[PDB]
Ligand binder design. Structure first.
Ligand SMILES: Nc1nc2c(ncn2[C@@H]2O[C@H](COP(=O)(O)OP(=O)(O)NP(=O)(O)O)[C@@H](O)[C@H]2O)c(=O)[nH]1
Ligand SMILES: Nc1nc2c(ncn2[C@@H]2O[C@H](COP(=O)(O)OP(=O)(O)NP(=O)(O)O)[C@@H](O)[C@H]2O)c(=O)[nH]1
Lengths: 122, 709, 709
């Protein structure tokens, strides 16, 4: 349940560490973002030498949440941290590697690149 | 211009440039690269804008501390210049680069005489048959005497050293050099290289230099009639002579002298030509002897891209973004992405030799002393490292050094080969460190990850060894010297966040009895569980060192129960483990406990009770006589030059040391047999190297124990 | 399969495939290559697996945007297929392919008729007297009517167009064809090409087709008695008819029609047979006139490997790893690896005609204005283009096309020959791009390399014209159209790292005085040193157009010191140059300044002060009257169909164009001569191709300057 003003860890090579959620894309007045939802964010912390710097508005997709999320099978998934992946307009990562596990919801949202690059998909 | 990508190892050259600390190796590398056209202008070491001088430690120390690799293209031939550290503290990196290259370049200043570190580095290059070409740099210095450096190199590094190109200048900014074999003088005075016939002011000297170079080269050639032809008045052909010079230089026989003016760009183009033609080839160079994975040796493999897959890492580091920058040097076969290579850890058995005492085999790191492991890992992206930025490599043929990312278990020097045919090359002999240092964590959480941090650092730093002391309960890091110690501590506190503070290293120590005495132990403790009360009477006698712990029982009539004899015994063992000299009692050793008498109760006898009863009997016995402390004397094999044996005799005399002999190690150095207390050997390596100017090598090995003087 | 290698020019064929955009040319080439054995299975443009559509731009636009070459040898005869883009924006590449070809092939689909762009392509092919053959394709389309398209072709391009192969299909997927000359029906129903006599279902129509083809050919046959014999009932022999057809096609006198099923592979084998038999050979082809370096005409060389060396690069491509890949068209002599050949850079004298503002001769790149350059380069390894793969070639005989890499300064259109006999083939016709595109670099680092990148761009694409404005200081790219402009921008932004931003083209303007006026110029400034005082009273009166700057002196009593009057004149000239209209004043021409009075100080009079006073007086005089703005006008000659005359005339009526005359270009097009202001021509091309179904073709040339209405 990421929403306005939420802080997210970044799981990429882009060089950013933490981002702030500006808007949850996918409809007007939409409140929450779960795994597999695209948001707009701003970069708060970064590598000094990274391509992405502080203060630039970027587009990301949530890959991990602390709030439990139900699956159609009756099972539930949960993580210890809220994490996101920087993407470009064609739903492709800006980085080259992904850190940590991701939920399989990304598979049904057509984020094939993130799914392939993740070390583990759950 | 075009990215250097050669389709054959013969069109690839890799040179590990060597020299003193801040000798201009990087500067010459930048000048050459600009001559090749990779860099717009040659950067300055001090400015830190060069491709090689990018790391934090290299810029901070204002010199080369970790080696760097750059790729160059010249007339369709690839050149891989490899800057190497100029300080003996990082001579392990230089050794790896020499092992990583088929040619070495001595970057020295014309205003500096050849120092002993340079001589020892030349010896290290020499007894691996690694070819060398003498390079004279820093000719712009006001005191730059090219002729003095030339003569010193010829006199020191054998008669095989002889000038190849003769510089011409006004004494302040050399305006050109003269090509002896090409009889043509190249002039840079007007800002443009001009291969023109000499003006004739030094025609006789040039001709003499041509004759000397020819006769020196002929000596190492094949045609024995060439000497008769040249001495008979016949002029040998220029092309044939050149080919003969290439043979002499490649075969690790000749060491031509090259003047270089890096600042003005004078001589860089002709140096590139010499690298491209006269320098040895990775196929021609005597490749390290290959080994089967299971300990058997194997015939050396040809530097053929079509041959069996064969490679060896030369540097390892961790990058959060691109990944682990594993500098892998390819020797046989072609390396391609998506290929699973063998990651054998040197199969250290083949490198357990040499390495001085420490048996330096693979990545040192005594906690991981000798890797000797196997692994097959799928490589990721092949990249040609240009400083931080990596040049993509779609195909990497044999005879090249490349950086491979996303290698999970890769370490420095690990041999990379085919999964179907695992292979092991001969890794470099690494100068195991002999300066111990102790690191204490600020808390427990950092210490928990300290193990993996030091393991990763040792994988990155093959020359570094990390030692854990179980007796004194501390972790000890061994570094070659001071600057390398600073670099490794910075890397530990940065790449792994290890917050520690330097502390004194404590040597192992033991306690022994100086006399014989008897003890009385009375225990009374009536608690809420089982009432405890036991009395024991033992006897202890002094025993020679190395006797260990002993126990004799002579109780009469079964006064103390047999079941509680183990209780008393173990109580005495724990009490003597805790020591007898105050609250800081060192482990008492080589003592015999002799129990004779004791009293028993119907119910108050217990395991713990009798344990303390024996303990207190031990205290009472120790209270009656003296306790002698022993320190472990270690055999020290001191290797110093024969002229420096007098210095070692003089200083070891002030070190309470005894000399058991001075055996001549070789024509220059001398092995000195001596045993010294361990307290004197914490800083022996650093002072030895400082006094010997890098000529000091020594071994340590605990022998026995001696009392306090 | 095997590398197609040719040792005699006769066994080589070089035919350029042309047609409409997306005419399935790439699929046809893939099917032919599969029939040739080089490719295992036919590729698909939609899937992007085709050899021809391998570049990023082609796949991005899903259409041919750049031309490619494929080599195939069939029946011992090598064929050099030249696929070219079918869009008008890439007409120059098609013309370059035509020049490097000895025949022209039109790939058209039966389900669509001949469009006007295809007719203009036929005209362009015709105006080198190139042989042309009609290939009907896409016979798998439901609407594919071979009969309708055939008829249209016969009616349009005269009676010389008669079909050569008669298909027999179901109207959906053509199962085979009937050989008209051989009376043989070819079948592919079972997936195998089977040649059998026709069953007689078309025997009457077959006989009609043989009669028409024989009567058409035999006329073009030198034997005039053959017509009598055939009309007298004599059956002309099949081999004789074949040979006569081959000769007539080699004469560019006949245009046969051969149906082809690219998808099904039907007819590919016979098509290759027709290419190998009926098509002219380079020895048969009228080789282009070869010129001496100094412009003296030279006799054309016979197409033989033993003749004088004569070759010509026709394509330049840039690759990050390989480097420049130059395709070399050889006509005479033999090219061998490692040989030094002469590079004649078009000898611009033969291409200096016209060119509009850019005056484009070859390789533009204003710093390299005109090519006209001569240089001898040693080539490396000969290679033949197979997609991104390069099959090494041992030697290149005359009459073939080869790919050479690592070429430092070789350019498209350059004439390669023996260094002892430099030659110059007649350059191809280069269409003049008339779509200026002003851009602005994002940084000066990009700007410095912009000249190099644009020079290399014009080296790759000779049809792109680059002009840097000297008045408005704008870099302007002249392009053919939307797709060509996009390609030009993208290649500049990627292949050379030049970040540029398209900006508004500035049409140069001129200024002159609209009436007589006087100005009072005072320059008084009291700084920390010498004071300044100079006053000039000048009189400026209008002059006829082109009168230039005239100075009239009317100073009475020497109020202005006579040593400072030239300073006043210099200030007036500088003020004219800097403009007189606001902050963006255009240069002032055709004015007269009459200095009749002024003031000066004994101490505070200086030449600079009088310069400033004259400039300020000129500025005041300009502000004392009106300023005439002169804009340029370019004469435009347009070729458009007679049915659209009124629409274009009215469009020019809304474009303020002045009609000069409507000249009959031909039976269906009218040449329109008119002068249009350059402002109206910024987007004239795009709107015209609209106002013309692309049929709009025009040329422009600067005429003069006129004041704004
Ligand atoms: N005058 C002069 N100074 C030089 C030259 N080469 C290097 N220097 C100077 O010496 C310092 C560093 O030189 P150098 O030790 O060769 O740098 P490095 O190659 O990075 N270290 P190392 O030589 O040990 O590999 C800098 O101040 C640099 O300007 C040279 O040819 N001439
Ligand atoms: N029915 C049919 N469609 C075809 C055939 N060849 C190509 N096409 C279709 O036509 C389109 C591309 O044709 P084409 O213009 O010849 O491709 P191109 O060669 O890249 N362009 P160009 O013809 O200008 O050289 C694609 O949609 C492709 O599927 C064919 O033989 N039959």
């Amino acid at each position: 349940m990421i929403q306005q003003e939420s802080r997210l860890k970044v799981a990429d090579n882009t060089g950013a560490k933490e981002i702030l959620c500006i808007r949850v894309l996918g409809g007007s007045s939409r409140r929450y973002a779960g795994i597999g939802d695209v948001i707009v964010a701003t970069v708060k912390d970064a590598i000094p030498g990274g391509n992405v710097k502080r203060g630039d508005v970027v587009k990301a997709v949530v890959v991990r949440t602390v709030k439990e999320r139900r699956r159609a099978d009756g099972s539930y998934i949960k993580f210890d941290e809220n994490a996101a992946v920087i993407i470009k307009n064609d739903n492709d990562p800006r980085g080259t590697r992904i850190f940590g596990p991701v939920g399989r919801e990304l598979r049904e949202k057509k984020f094939m690149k993130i799914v392939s690059l993740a070390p583990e998909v759950l | 211009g075009s990215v250097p990508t050669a389709e054959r190892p013969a069109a690839i050259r890799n040179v590990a440039l060597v020299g003193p600390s801040g000798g201009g190796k990087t500067t010459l590398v930048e000048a050459l690269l600009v001559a090749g056209g990779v860099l717009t202008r040659p950067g300055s070491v001090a400015d830190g804008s060069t491709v090689c001088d990018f790391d934090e430690a290299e810029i901070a120390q204002q010199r080369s501390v970790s080696l760097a690799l750059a790729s160059l293209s010249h007339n369709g031939i690839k050149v891989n210049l490899i800057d190497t550290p100029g300080y003996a503290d990082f001579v392990g990196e230089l050794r790896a680069g020499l092992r990583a290259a088929d040619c070495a370049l001595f970057v020295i200043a014309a205003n500096e005489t050849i120092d002993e570190p340079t001589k020892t580095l030349w010896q290290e290059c020499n007894e691996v048959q690694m070819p060398r070409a003498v390079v004279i740099t820093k000719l712009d210095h006001p005191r730059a005497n090219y002729d003095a450096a030339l003569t010193a190199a010829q006199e020191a590094f054998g008669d095989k050293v002889a000038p190849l190109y003769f510089p011409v200048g006004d004494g302040e900014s050399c305006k050109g050099v003269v090509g002896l074999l090409t009889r043509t003088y190249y002039d840079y005075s007007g800002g443009t290289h001009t291969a023109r016939p000499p003006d004739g002011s030094h025609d006789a000297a040039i001709a003499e230099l041509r004759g000397s170079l020819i006769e020196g080269v002929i000596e190492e050639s094949e045609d024995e009639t060439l000497m008769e032809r040249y001495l008979g008045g016949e002029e040998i052909d220029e092309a044939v002579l050149i080919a003969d010079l290439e043979k002499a230089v490649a075969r690790a026989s000749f060491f031509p002298v090259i003047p270089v003016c890096s600042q003005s760009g004078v001589g860089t183009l002709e140096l590139l030509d010499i690298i491209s033609r006269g320098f040895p080839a990775p196929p021609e160079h005597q490749l390290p002897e290959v080994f089967t994975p299971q300990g058997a040796p194997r015939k050396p493999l040809s530097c053929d891209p079509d041959g069996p897959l064969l490679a060896e890492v030369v540097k390892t580091t961790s990058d959060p973004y691109v990944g682990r920058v594993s500098l892998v040097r390819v020797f046989s076969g072609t390396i391609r992405p998506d290929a699973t290579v063998h990651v054998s850890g040197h199969f250290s058995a083949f490198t357990d030799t040499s390495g001085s005492h420490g048996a330096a085999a693979a990545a040192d790191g005594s906690t991981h002393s000798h890797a000797d492991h196997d692994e097959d890992e799928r490589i990721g992206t092949l990249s040609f490292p240009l400083g931080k930025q990596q040049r993509p490599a779609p195909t990497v043929v044999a005879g090249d050094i490349c950086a491979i990312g996303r290698l999970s278990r890769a370490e420095t020097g690990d041999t990379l080969s085919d999964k179907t045919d695992p292979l092991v090359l001969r890794p470099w002999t690494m100068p195991d460190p002999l300066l111990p240092i102790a690191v204490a964590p600020r808390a427990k959480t950092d210490e928990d990850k300290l193990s993996v941090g030091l393991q990763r650092l040792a994988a990155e730093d093959p020359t570094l060894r990390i030692e854990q002391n179980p007796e004194t309960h501390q972790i000890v890091l061994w570094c070659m010297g001071e600057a390398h110690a600073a670099v490794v501590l910075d890397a530990l506190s940065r790449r792994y966040g290890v917050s520690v503070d330097t502390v004194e290293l404590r040597v192992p120590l033991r306690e022994t009895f100086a006399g014989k005495a008897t003890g009385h132990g009375r225990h009374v403790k009536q608690s809420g569980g089982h009432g405890q009360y036991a009395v024991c009477d033992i006897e202890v006698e002094p025993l020679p060192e190395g006797s260990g712990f002993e126990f004799v029982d002579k109780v009469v009539g079964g006064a103390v129960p047999r079941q509680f004899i183990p209780s008393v015994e173990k109580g005495v063992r724990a009490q003597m483990e805790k020591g007898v000299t105050g609250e800081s009692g060192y482990p008492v050793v080589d003592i015999r406990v002799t129990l004779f008498d004791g009293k028993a109760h119907s119910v108050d006898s217990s395991d713990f009770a009798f344990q303390m009863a024996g303990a207190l009997a031990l205290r009472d016995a120790a209270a009656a006589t003296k306790i002698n402390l022993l320190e472990p004397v270690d055999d020290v094999t001191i290797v110093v030059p024969d002229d420096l044996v007098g210095t070692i005799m003089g200083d070891l005399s002030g070190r309470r040391g005894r000399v058991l002999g001075t055996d001549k190690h070789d024509a220059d150095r001398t092995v000195i047999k001596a045993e010294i207390p361990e307290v004197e050997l914490v800083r022996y390596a650093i002072d030895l190297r400082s006094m010997s100017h890098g000529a000091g090598q020594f071994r340590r090995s605990f022998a026995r124990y001696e009392p306090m003087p």
